[PDB]
Amino acid sequence: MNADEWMTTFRENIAQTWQQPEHYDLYIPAITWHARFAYNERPWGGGFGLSRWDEKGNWHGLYAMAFKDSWNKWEPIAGYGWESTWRPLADENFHLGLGFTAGVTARDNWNYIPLPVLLPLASVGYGPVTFQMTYIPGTYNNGNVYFAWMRFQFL
């Protein structure tokens, strides 16, 4: 795909989620686990966002969250999320998704200097209740971890 076009469509999709949002979400960090067991830490925090389901049935969100990181220091993050969404069952309320988030975070490790974030997203949910997650890539201490939250859609 073309990058000028891609960029305008991305920017467009962000602006429509801010200007014409459909719902709010409550984000409740739930669980982290490692991808390569030889896991279950439970982060404290929370967040809020705006979201919509588009004409293709795909999810868009703008969010702001804060959680305790792996040194038990507050870690804020804000960004955009998108998922390609499928509703494969007879009850259309079940939804499965895969996508990405782009945003900015900051950590105590680096004196809260802002850091750009680009990570994958996946989710499964029923109606307004969704278990959604990311994966932090890295080989050795850096990452290889999943982080999941409950997302409760309201209004």
Ligand SMILES: CCCCCCCCCCCCOS(=O)(=O)O
């Ligand atoms: C509770 C959510 C907070 C999320 C982070 C802030 C989003 C900033 C605006 C994005 C839309 C860009 O604005 S627009 O004027 O181009 O449409």
Ligand SMILES: CCCCCCCCCCCCOS(=O)(=O)O
């Ligand atoms: C860089 C900061 C990002 C915002 C985090 C929210 C701070 C609220 C104050 C709780 C202090 C600690 O309270 S405790 O519930 O953790 O004991």
Ligand SMILES: CCCCCCCCCCCCOS(=O)(=O)O
């Ligand atoms: C739709 C909501 C999306 C929420 C995404 C949460 C990502 C948190 C981790 C940021 C990167 C941290 O990188 S680190 O290597 O410094 O840990």
Ligand SMILES: CCCCCCCCCCCCOS(=O)(=O)O
């Ligand atoms: C937490 C796990 C997320 C998994 C995401 C991948 C979902 C792929 C589903 C295809 C749906 C079936 O096809 S459908 O065309 O009938 O909808």
Ligand SMILES: CCCCCCCCCCCCOS(=O)(=O)O
């Ligand atoms: C639409 C009517 C109002 C919403 C209440 C639905 C409660 C769903 C709880 C389970 C979600 C579990 O996620 S699951 O999709 O894997 O089951």
Ligand SMILES: [Li+]
């Ligand atoms: Li709404």
